[PDB]
């Protein structure tokens, strides 16, 4: 299917890294690694379970960075009394996501904290 | 000014309730009192509700619901992935789309929280 050390799954290739890097660096690492490569994105339940088995089985990894994050001034935050949120008493820091290879749940996690990850590219 | 059990300020009346309730319920009640969950505009009205919350919830072990939430149709709010993929499927263990005054910072910071987590709240009329 794919190329050495990368596992193949439905037109895509995944490789788990134990190296433990930050979210923003892990993504940068997946890009300057493979042409059109990225930090793993889960578009189905079966794809997520494939990754977890890959990360848990051949590497016994529990947490991995996923290509999902955002800042609050990006979300549709609205009040209930009508006012328009301009006073951002919310940290500007971004939210990041890790996947757990046990149940496949996604958990918010501090971005600037090293975590093993998973890269993904399309053949 | 308002009801004795409440506190007036800038043409608005607030009050912190020790009794817990989901973000939903908390609002359904604020409305039942001709209002909504507190909303902050100025930094003035902010530290005010901070004191107001600080004075009432003297113990600091609970977060107080406010009137801010994430309208997002999705579990988490990121619409696109890093690879350009549209966020269709999700599996967030527990999405947090309802904000409340962060008690771990003395109610001065806002923290998103699980809507459904029974916390005390703040109403405004």
């Amino acid at each position: 299917g794919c190329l050495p050390d990368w596992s193949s799954y439905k037109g895509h290739c995944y490789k788990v890294f134990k190296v433990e890097k930050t979210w923003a660096d892990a993504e940068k690492f997946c890009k300057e690694l493979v042409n059109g490569g990225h930090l793993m994105s889960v578009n189905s339940r079966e794809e997520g379970e494939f990754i977890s088995k890959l990360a848990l089985e051949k590497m016994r990894i529990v947490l991995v960075w996923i290509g999902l994050s955002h800042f609050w001034r990006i979300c549709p935050l609205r009040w209930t009394d009508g006012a328009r949120l301009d006073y951002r008493a919310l940290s500007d820091e971004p939210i990041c996501f890790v996947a757990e290879s046990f149940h496949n749940k996604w958990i918010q996690w501090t971005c600037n904290r090293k975590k093993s990850f998973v890269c993904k590219y399309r053949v | 000014g308002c009801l004795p059990d409440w506190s007036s300020y800038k043409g608005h009346c607030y009050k912190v309730f020790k009794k817990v309730g989901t973000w939903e319920d908390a609002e359904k009640f604020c409305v039942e009192n001709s209002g909504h969950l507190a909303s902050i505009d100025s930094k003035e009205e902010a530290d005010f509700v901070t004191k107001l919350a600080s004075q009432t919830l003297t113990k600091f072990v609970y977060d107080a619901w406010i009137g801010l939430r994430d309208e997002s149709k999705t579990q988490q709010c990121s619409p696109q992935w890093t690879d350009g993929s549209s966020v269709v499927y999700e599996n967030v263990d527990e999405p947090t789309k309802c904000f409340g005054l962060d008690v771990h910072t003395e109610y001065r910071t806002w923290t998103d929280l699980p809507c459904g987590e029974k916390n005390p709240f703040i109403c405004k009329s």
Binding site: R60, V62, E100, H103, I107, W109, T110, R113 | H104
Partner: protein, 202 residues
Amino acid sequence: EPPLHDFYCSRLLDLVFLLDGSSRLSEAEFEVLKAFVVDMMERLRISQKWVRVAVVEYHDGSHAYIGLKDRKRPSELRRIASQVKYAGSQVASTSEVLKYTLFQIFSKIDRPEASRIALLLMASQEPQRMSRNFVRYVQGLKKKKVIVIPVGIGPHANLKQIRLIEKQAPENKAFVLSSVDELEQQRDEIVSYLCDLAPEAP
């Protein structure tokens, strides 16, 4: 007593081993855990002037087998660690143990030169009720400069609490292992990190 293995952290350090005592770990798994504590100790210059060691098995409450001021033979301590009785309780309150660590173990920083580290070996999740003051304790530690290294083991670890800890400071590097078997593996990567947080005897 001379250095058993080459890995021989010799810096000013006060390390506290907190061992999950819940039944989320079989008896055998607990032994593998206890074996971990011993291995680590075989890689530390356990002296009152270098690396002091403490071992605590927590469950409903906390039971200390070794304290930082226990001036015993380094071999005698590892022997104690290896013989740590198995509780198997239903709940292993991390809050209760971190409270203990903060209000008892490091109640007074009488060793200002050394670094304080709490290796929180956890394999379960305490009921949301005992977690009332969790953050307040973790914060208290941050003030006492007591680094807290959350080590998640098995599929029942808290993760939410682990994350909370790793969020207080970067020094609180977390480790999420698939099982106790991963203790043997990542044992060294842990001692290196643990060691690199301690000063250096001038």
